[PDB]
Amino acid sequence: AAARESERQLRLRLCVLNEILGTERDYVGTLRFLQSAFLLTEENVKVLFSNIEDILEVHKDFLAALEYCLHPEPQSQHELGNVFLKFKDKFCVYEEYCSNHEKALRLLVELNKIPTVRAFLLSCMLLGGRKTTDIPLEGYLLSPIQRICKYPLLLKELAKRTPGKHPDHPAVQSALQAMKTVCSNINETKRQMEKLEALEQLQSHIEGWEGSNLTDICTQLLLQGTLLKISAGNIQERAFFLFDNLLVYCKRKSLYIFRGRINTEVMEVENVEDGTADYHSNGYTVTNGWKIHNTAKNKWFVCMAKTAEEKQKWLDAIIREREQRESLKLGMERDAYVMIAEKGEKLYHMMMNKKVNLIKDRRSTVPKCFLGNEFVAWLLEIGEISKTEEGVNLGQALLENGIIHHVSDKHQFKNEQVMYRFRYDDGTYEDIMSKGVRLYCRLHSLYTPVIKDRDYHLKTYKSVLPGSKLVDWLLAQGDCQTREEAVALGVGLCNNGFMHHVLFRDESQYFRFHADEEMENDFKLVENILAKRLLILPQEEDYGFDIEEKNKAVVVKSVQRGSLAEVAGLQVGRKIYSINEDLVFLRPFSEVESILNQSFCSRRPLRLLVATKAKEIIKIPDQPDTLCFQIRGAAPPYVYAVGRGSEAMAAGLCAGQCILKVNGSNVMNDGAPEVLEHFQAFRSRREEALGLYQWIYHTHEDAQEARASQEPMVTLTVDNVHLEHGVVYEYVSTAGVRCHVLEKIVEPRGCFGLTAKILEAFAANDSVFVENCRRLMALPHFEFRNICDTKLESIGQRIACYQEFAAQLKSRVSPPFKQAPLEPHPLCGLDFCPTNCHINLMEVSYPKLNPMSYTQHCITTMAAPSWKCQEDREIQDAYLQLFTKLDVALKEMKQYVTQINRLLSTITIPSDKQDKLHGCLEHLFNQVDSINALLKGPVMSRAFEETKHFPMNHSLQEFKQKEECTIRGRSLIQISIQEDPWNLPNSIKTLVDNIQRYVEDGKNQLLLALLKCTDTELQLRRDAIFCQALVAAVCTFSEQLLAALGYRYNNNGEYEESSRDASRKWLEQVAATGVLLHCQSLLSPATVKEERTMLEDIWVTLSELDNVTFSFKQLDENYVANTNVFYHIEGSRQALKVIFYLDSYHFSKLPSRLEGGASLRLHTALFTKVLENVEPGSQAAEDLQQDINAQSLEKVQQYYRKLRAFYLERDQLIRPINALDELCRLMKSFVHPKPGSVGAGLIPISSELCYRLGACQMVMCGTGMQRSTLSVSLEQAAILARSHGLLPKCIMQATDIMRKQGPRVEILAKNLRVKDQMPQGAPRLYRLC
Ligand SMILES: O=P(O)(O)O[C@H]1[C@H](O)[C@@H](OP(=O)(O)O)[C@H](OP(=O)(O)O)[C@@H](OP(=O)(O)O)[C@H]1O
Secondary structure (H helix, E strand, C coil): HHHHHHHHHHHHHHHHHHHHHHHHHHHHHHHHHHHHCCCCCCHHHHCCCCCCCCHHHHHHHHHHHHHCCCCCCCCCCHHHHHHHHHHHHHHHHHHHHHHHHHHHHHHHHHHHHCCHHHHHHHHHHHHCCCCCCCCCCHHHHCCCCCCHHHHHHHHHHHHHCCCCCCCCCHHHHHHHHHHHHHHHCCCCCHHHHHHHHHHHHHCEEECCCCCCCCCCCCCCEEECCCCCCCEEEECEEEEEEEEECCEEECCCCCCEEEEEEEEEHHEEEEECCCCCCCCCCCCCCCCCCEEEEEECEEEEEEEEEECHHHHHHHHHHHHHHHHHHHHHHHHHHHHHHHHHHHHHHHHHHHHHHHCCCCCCCEEECEEEEEEEHHHHHHHHHCCCCCCCHHHHHHHHHHHHHCCCCCCCCCCCCCCCCCCCEEEECCCCCHHHHHHHHHHHHHHCCCCCCCCCEEEEEEEEEEEEEHHHHHHHHHCCCCCCCCHHHHHHHHHHHHHHHCCCCCCCCCCCCCCEHHHHHHHHCHHHEEEECCCCEEECCCEEEEEEECEEEEECCCCCCEECCCCCCHHCCCCCCCEECCCCCCEEECCCCCHHHHHHHHHHHHCCEEEEEEECCCCCEEEEEECCCCCCCCCEECCCEEECCCCCCCCHHHHHCCCCCCCEEECCCCCCCCCCHHHHCCHHHHHCCCCCCCCCCCCCCCCHHHHHHHHHHHHHHEEEEECCCEEEECCCCEEEEECCHHHHHCEEECCCCCHHHHHHHHHHHHHHHHHHHHHHHHHHHCCCHHHHHHHHHHHHHHHHHHHHHHHHHHHHHHCCCCCEEEEECCCCCCCHHHHHHCCCCCCCCCCCCCCCCCCCCCCCCCEECCCCCCCCCCCHHHHHHHHHHHHHHHHHHHHHHHHHHHHHHHHHHCCCCHHHHHHHHHHHHHHHHHCCCHHHHHCCCCCHHHHHHHHCCCCCCHHHHHHHHHHHHHHHHHHHHHHHHHHHHHHEEEEHHHCCCCCCCCHHHHHHEEEEEEEHHHCHHHHHHHHHHHHHHHHHHHHHHHHHHHHCCCCCCCCCCCCCCCCHHHHHHHHHHHHHCCCCEEECCCCCCCCCCCHHHHHHHHHHHHHHCCCEEEECCCCCCCEHHHHHHHHCCCCCEEEEEECCCCCCCHCCCCCCCHHCCECCCCCCEECCCCCCCCCHHHHHHHHHHHHHHHHHHHHHHHCCCCHHHHHHCCCCHHHHHHHHHHHHHHHHHHHCCCCCCCCHHHHHHHHHHHHHCCCCCEECCCCHHHHHHHHHHHHHHHHHHHHCCCCHHHHHHHHHHHHHHHHHHHHHHCCCCCCCCCCCCCCCCCCCC
């Protein structure tokens, strides 16, 4: 074996020789190419290259000597030290270039700043054949320093390999000394040599090194440390080393042992949650963790750092490196590509000339074919190129650069006279709608008029634009730098049918937009309508209710007994409007039948509308048998249910109906018994006339309550509620197709039950808190505890008030919404429903029976946070968060303790098992230390200071000195493992439980301080306001998600995107990250102080709202009429986990991930700017506006980074992403007060931005009446123009039809007490026209 060891050393020496040979051959080839292609004023060339020729010749002689030395092939009996010494003097050639290198690199930097000389250098580099993208000139230029610093290393290496019997060792050592002296005499080589020697010393500490040497592909030790990992279902602590394109982890015990390393280019970075545990984590919770991949082993692993700061350091460094290298290589390749395109264009045109015309239609005849031979002869002839190979390689690049191609496209570029063709010959070789829409909006958004009526030929033209002035303004805002940009934009606009001359051009010609031409048919109405959304579900054979034509108006034929339609309350004799959100009153009868058949085969959940009126008269037979319904509320009674399969269906009886009069009897104020007695069944028996009947309930809230607890005609005058003032529109598309913008305004169907359940969750949470606080406090000081108990009684009183509000809000049915208060009064259930909530829908219907498209864009409305009847607050929030973190940490620590105890049981062997246990124990100790620090946080210290007036078995100083005890326990664990692993589990339990006791002490003190520093009035107000905001958010997202599940919602139609894909994509985008809420508050804080304070409150309540989290859980019912989304609440304030219980069809369509109830977060976004003209306190209000906008901009930008990262992890996005980037630039400009001119285009532009994203929309205003309808119609109009082919000639046509004719007048129709007015000084785009 020893002979084999000597033979291995011999092989190593041979390897050193072979690599020396290869390196020298490669270097001389580098010099060969550099001199052959390059050797632009000639002084530049000489200064750059200096003395490469003498160096090249020295290396040539050296290589010849070496080659003869290895003659015929390398062996172990050759000598080279003499060859080295002989050239020792010859290496002074390097000094000249080393000195010149500074000037050469500075000159090359200058040239790089020169595009033409740089591209010329690139062309020359590409000519020869070397792929330029591989290496730039700079590496070749700087190579000599590296080569000279490396030769000593090669000498010493070969000396180490050299067998002792071989006498060349002293000679090689002398040569090494000479090379070191030569390197030293030049200080520039000193830096490279010292870096190399330091790296080699670091490697010398590596035991069992593998792979190429570190100095080869590395230059700097970026970072190092210790970091854990999971692998093969096991854990093994490791220390990672960070070198450029190299991640080196070694098994520390020379202090390091090789385990494995990765190349970054085959490396991936993926981040996980703080609290995840999956198969890749082998069911282990993750802290500060992230995922990496080695595609070589095509397996992943997780890396968990000791702290957050450590993880941040690692991510920052690794990113920085990958970012720099990516940017460098992308820039180089793109510059090369653009240069190829430019040169190809120039030369192609030069060939197109008749002079020595090479492009020709020769022979199947091949039009415009050129021979590579004649092409290259011409290129050389013009002096551009000097070698046939240079040109043929360049033509090969062009063919590969998609500039030319073989006639048959079955060959590459060869010097032969092979037929070749350009992509221009065969013809083989957007941002306007958004640009124009914005352009108009911004321009007319200005305060000081700009786009104005002007006198042309002594006759004023209305609202024209001096193209000169257009360019001047475009430059004024940095929107266009040079007049070329503005002129190009104006040319586009002119061809784009937005503006035209009064009779684009860069002079004083005057232009107005076609929209003002319409101002100074294509958008109209058809009808106005009121509807009730009769959500129906499929039955055994049909969807429940047939139809028939009557008065050429689609009407119901009959409703079959025992129908889900009868569940929803579908009558006979009602005109229909929609069927599957698909219009039918503008369609033939048979077409409506086809729509129904298609929905059946698709088994879709219908979302119809109907033609039922605000009052109805009902005649019911009265047998002396049973009531067949119920009633409740001394307030205007509302039918509370109705039997199924009964004449009550026949008579036209439906849940929720609010009876006003019966047989000509005023009851609207009287109680239930009054109407009850009129029925013979009630006369027979008071309550015993309620025969068994499948009871169908107004809301889930009472359906569940009644169901759990249980386990000769009469005229009626019922006043309905929760109706839908449907409008229609019509217009002819820009594509020419026909459209119906079937707007609606629904009121939030499931609104009450949500306020009820949220207040119930508040009550239960407060009750549990009270129970625990009371128990803890029971066991100066006496009066302190008495004060605490008084606070606790106050909490209980708040709980009772919450319960009473729950009862009330269960009682109320009418009116459908909370009237805006005009007077103060004590609290009441109505105070926690949203103030004037609504859902301004939209649709579309134009074919791609025949195919059709659809969409939606909800826009909810709601007044400012309504209530009339911080430092300590942030302290309290800090306590809340600390408690939550501590408890969660205790839970996960217990889980992991169980995991490790099971592992110890399994330990009950190969040393790798001992080492894995060691690493696991180290992780346990690390988590323990983390928890200890969290306990020791200043929040806890202040808490203890607050609790000093209460007896306790632990003190701040006692806890601090417990650190020594914890260190002792850890050392005792170490002693146990050293002596016997069987003593370890007991110490594990001991420490776990002792620290648990510490935790309980801490949270006791935390709760004590919380009570010690809490006030109830502000908390009650805050809960109210959050309740409103969350109600709005929940209903909004309910609507939008329900849209998605129907395969409707579509926020990107400008890319010919089918609805189905848009729905799936948005839904899963949410499931990955979540949803963003855009609150476009339009309040005027400088106007009313009250609205300013309401703005502050809505802002802070949104900030709190961020914590909310949703999740889904199937839920089945046959006992509610027209609500799929049986909402629910649970959890607490800090994390209120709502459950949008959906139904079976509305559960299958849920993406795969969420089907188990996984958190969807919820991000807030608030933007404020007073629509009317700006005209210290108000300065502070404006500053508040700016801060709100800034924070919201940061949050949206972060979500944008997240979304782009998702998609990149997940081509067509180039358009939307660039447009989004421009939008972000616009927003930054707006919010940034860089040196009124911005007007108010922020509102529309930002609305566009959020709609482009997956965001669900929402808007709040002063009073819900005037300041909001305008903005809403504006946004709807812009969406239409941007998404479904409207004629941008009709923009203001739509903008004014809406704000004058459409649903948005029913806000004033159903509401009269409200007080509001339209804007008085708004820009043109807002004011009515
Ligand atoms: O020593 P044994 O008991 O065989 O376990 C080894 C180590 O855990 C390695 O981890 P480390 O690299 O930290 O030393 C791991 O390499 P990876 O982490 O690269 O997967 C091996 O992965 P497999 O070869 O896939 O099992 C695993 O088998």
